[PDB]
Amino acid sequence: TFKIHAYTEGGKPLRTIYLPKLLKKVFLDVVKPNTKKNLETCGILCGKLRQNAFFITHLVIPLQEATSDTCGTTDEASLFEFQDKHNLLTLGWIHTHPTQTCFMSSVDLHTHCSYQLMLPEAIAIVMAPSKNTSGIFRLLDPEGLQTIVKCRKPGLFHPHEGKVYTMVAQPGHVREINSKLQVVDLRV
Numbered sequence: 492t493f494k495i496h497a498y499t500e501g502g503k504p505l506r507t508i509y510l511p512k513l514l515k516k517v518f519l520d521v522v523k524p525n526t527k528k529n530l531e532t533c534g535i536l537c538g539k540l541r542q543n544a545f546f547i548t549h550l551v552i553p554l555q556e557a558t559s560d561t562c563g564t565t566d567e568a569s570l571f572e573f574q575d576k577h578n579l580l581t582l583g584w585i586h587t588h589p590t591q592t593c594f595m596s597s598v599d600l601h602t603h604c605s606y607q608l609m610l611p612e613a614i615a616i617v618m619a620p621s622k623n624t625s626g627i628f629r630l631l632d633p634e635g636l637q638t639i640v641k642c643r644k645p646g647l648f649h650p651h652e653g654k655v656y657t658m659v660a661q662p663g664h665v666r667e668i669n670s671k672l673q674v675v676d677l678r679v
């Protein structure tokens with residue numbers, strides 16, 4: 492089996508996620524028409540659990556509502572049906588900041604909380620192509636998760652107090668390898 496090389500702030504194990512080296516570049520290429528119009532796009536990181544590690548095998552672009560600051564999924568039935576038919580786990584998500592810097596926004600933090608509650612290893616990849624930067628983030632666990640779970644603040648740009656999120660350990664939590672990737676587009 493693959494061994495544990497990363498632990499949460501609460502001392503709980505994080506299984507390795509193997510990320511295809513091509514994924515970030517290919518994602519940017521797929522969503523480039525939106526990026527050029529200053530519109531965010533997201534993709535879902537999908538894959539399999541094998542010998543105590545996760546492997547991202549599919550990049551799935553879901554039905555979603557593009558704006559300059561958000562890219563929430565709309566009708567998830569097709570996403571759920573695709574993952575069901577292909578026996579794929581949700582391992583995280585990737586999205587663009589077409590013109591801004593690389594960080595997790597207020598909405599990104601609320602979005603990611605549900606991913607990371609479902610799977611402690613879940614990751615949020617953020618691409619900032621106009622800056623040529625990217626990052627892979629997670630919430631602090633338990634503290635950051637607690638903060639977002641409890642948050643009832645109004646406004647979609649509202650700030651949060653304290654240390655809420657961090658970059659993931661690489662290669663301890665996420666490791667990049669030369670693996671295959673299927674790109675699936677569920678949009679019209």
Ligand SMILES: [Zn+2]
Nearest residue numbers: 588595596599
């Ligand atoms: Zn964002």
Ligand SMILES: [Zn+2]
Nearest residue numbers: 639642644651
């Ligand atoms: Zn909040």
